[PDB]
Design an enzyme around this catalytic site. Structure first.
Site, mmCIF file in Angstrom:
data_model
loop_
_atom_site.group_PDB
_atom_site.id
_atom_site.type_symbol
_atom_site.label_atom_id
_atom_site.label_comp_id
_atom_site.label_asym_id
_atom_site.label_seq_id
_atom_site.Cartn_x
_atom_site.Cartn_y
_atom_site.Cartn_z
ATOM 1 N N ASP A 53 0.850 -1.189 0.000
ATOM 2 C CA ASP A 53 0.000 0.000 0.000
ATOM 3 C C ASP A 53 0.888 1.241 0.000
ATOM 4 O OD1 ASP A 53 -1.945 1.918 0.237
ATOM 5 O OD2 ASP A 53 -2.840 1.101 2.056
ATOM 6 N N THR A 54 1.077 1.824 -1.186
ATOM 7 C CA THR A 54 1.880 3.036 -1.313
ATOM 8 C C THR A 54 1.185 4.254 -0.719
ATOM 9 O OG1 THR A 54 0.989 3.404 -3.535
ATOM 10 C CG2 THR A 54 3.052 2.160 -3.357
ATOM 11 N N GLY A 55 -0.114 4.168 -0.472
ATOM 12 C CA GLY A 55 -0.854 5.236 0.157
ATOM 13 C C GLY A 55 -0.822 5.242 1.663
HETATM 14 C C1 LIG Z 1 -6.535 0.026 5.141
HETATM 15 C C2 LIG Z 1 -7.296 0.930 4.160
HETATM 16 C C3 LIG Z 1 -7.211 0.471 2.690
HETATM 17 C C4 LIG Z 1 -7.587 -1.020 2.451
HETATM 18 C C5 LIG Z 1 -8.835 -1.501 3.192
HETATM 19 C C6 LIG Z 1 -8.045 1.382 1.757
HETATM 20 N N1 LIG Z 1 -7.620 2.807 1.678
HETATM 21 C C7 LIG Z 1 -6.444 3.154 0.867
HETATM 22 C C8 LIG Z 1 -5.227 3.361 1.768
HETATM 23 O O1 LIG Z 1 -4.110 3.393 0.931
HETATM 24 C C9 LIG Z 1 -5.387 4.612 2.633
HETATM 25 C C10 LIG Z 1 -5.177 5.908 1.837
HETATM 26 C C11 LIG Z 1 -5.331 7.153 2.679
HETATM 27 C C12 LIG Z 1 -4.244 8.025 2.875
HETATM 28 C C13 LIG Z 1 -4.413 9.163 3.654
HETATM 29 F F1 LIG Z 1 -3.357 9.982 3.821
HETATM 30 C C14 LIG Z 1 -5.622 9.487 4.262
HETATM 31 C C15 LIG Z 1 -6.683 8.612 4.056
HETATM 32 F F2 LIG Z 1 -7.866 8.916 4.641
HETATM 33 C C16 LIG Z 1 -6.562 7.458 3.284
HETATM 34 N N2 LIG Z 1 -4.374 4.574 3.684
HETATM 35 C C17 LIG Z 1 -4.664 4.469 5.001
HETATM 36 O O2 LIG Z 1 -5.747 4.457 5.524
HETATM 37 O O3 LIG Z 1 -3.487 4.379 5.649
HETATM 38 C C18 LIG Z 1 -3.520 4.584 7.070
HETATM 39 C C19 LIG Z 1 -2.301 3.801 7.526
HETATM 40 O O4 LIG Z 1 -1.232 4.699 7.300
HETATM 41 C C20 LIG Z 1 -1.666 6.059 7.494
HETATM 42 O O5 LIG Z 1 -1.211 6.927 6.490
HETATM 43 C C21 LIG Z 1 -2.289 7.240 5.585
HETATM 44 C C22 LIG Z 1 -3.506 7.233 6.513
HETATM 45 C C23 LIG Z 1 -3.206 6.038 7.459
HETATM 46 S S1 LIG Z 1 -8.810 3.972 1.787
HETATM 47 O O6 LIG Z 1 -8.187 5.258 1.409
HETATM 48 O O7 LIG Z 1 -9.564 3.744 3.010
HETATM 49 C C24 LIG Z 1 -9.915 3.555 0.422
HETATM 50 C C25 LIG Z 1 -9.635 3.921 -0.905
HETATM 51 C C26 LIG Z 1 -10.548 3.567 -1.885
HETATM 52 C C27 LIG Z 1 -11.737 2.867 -1.578
HETATM 53 C C28 LIG Z 1 -12.637 2.564 -2.801
HETATM 54 C C29 LIG Z 1 -12.848 3.737 -3.763
HETATM 55 O O8 LIG Z 1 -12.115 1.351 -3.306
HETATM 56 C C30 LIG Z 1 -11.968 2.497 -0.226
HETATM 57 C C31 LIG Z 1 -11.063 2.846 0.769
#
Ligand SMILES: CCC(CC)CN(C[C@@H](O)[C@H](Cc1cc(F)cc(F)c1)NC(=O)O[C@H]1CO[C@H]2OCC[C@H]21)S(=O)(=O)c1ccc([C@@H](C)O)cc1
Lengths: 99, 99
Positions: free
Chosen positions: B25-27
């Site tokens: 997860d690069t996000g």
């Molecule tokens: C585990 C969650 C993941 C798998 C279930 C899904 N997600 C993607 C992640 O990559 C998420 C990205 C993110 C980055 C932020 F800066 C802020 C933020 F709100 C979200 N990262 C994340 O929550 O990371 C946590 C841990 O590390 C921290 O840094 C970053 C915030 C903290 S999601 O975005 O919920 C998402 C996207 C798309 C859908 C539909 C369209 O499919 C549903 C859900």
């Protein structure tokens, strides 16, 4: 481009005539953008992540230019903390993970 | 290996003698694992996502072997919907985005 991950992978996007910054996110199945007026017809949808769920407007066949690479697909618009480019659009610009 | 994104980039990890799958997860800035039994002392912490925030147990200097690549770093354990390998560990195994 090749992007290391020491910093957040933010790219510049063009959508609806607007310029934004968005996180290239391999953990997102679909694209989620902060609230914006995106032209087109839309259907309500709910999406979940860490901390719970948010309500979004689902928009189909939306053009986005990601780092100068054009893609068309479903774009979700709602109260996300950050603009997220999901795999539905990452596949169109040929994005891969490498190690 | 190079990984396309037509499917979720799920990999097998080994942590604490236990085998799990986790999403590259690069996000995600940080690594967050579904509830599991991790030996050691841990500190309470709060992390935020799309739906809000969750309380997690923070474990430092944890060894993870991600797809056969060894990394040591902080692992957060809590009520995440999915196991996610974040940038703190992706940088250690040389993961890049390419398009
Ligand atoms: C585990 C969650 C993941 C798998 C279930 C899904 N997600 C993607 C992640 O990559 C998420 C990205 C993110 C980055 C932020 F800066 C802020 C933020 F709100 C979200 N990262 C994340 O929550 O990371 C946590 C841990 O590390 C921290 O840094 C970053 C915030 C903290 S999601 O975005 O919920 C998402 C996207 C798309 C859908 C539909 C369209 O499919 C549903 C859900």
């Amino acid at each position: 481009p090749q992007i290391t991950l020491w910093k957040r992978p933010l790219v510049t996007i063009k959508i609806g005539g607007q310029l934004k910054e968005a996180l290239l996110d391999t953990g997102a199945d679909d694209t989620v953008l902060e609230e914006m007026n995106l032209p087109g017809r839309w259907k309500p949808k709910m999406i979940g992540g860490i901390g719970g769920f948010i309500k979004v407007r689902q928009y189909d066949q939306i053009l986005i230019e990601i780092c100068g690479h054009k893609a068309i697909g479903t774009v979700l618009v709602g109260p996300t903390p950050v603009n997220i480019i999901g795999r539905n659009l990452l596949t169109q610009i040929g994005c891969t993970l490498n190690f």
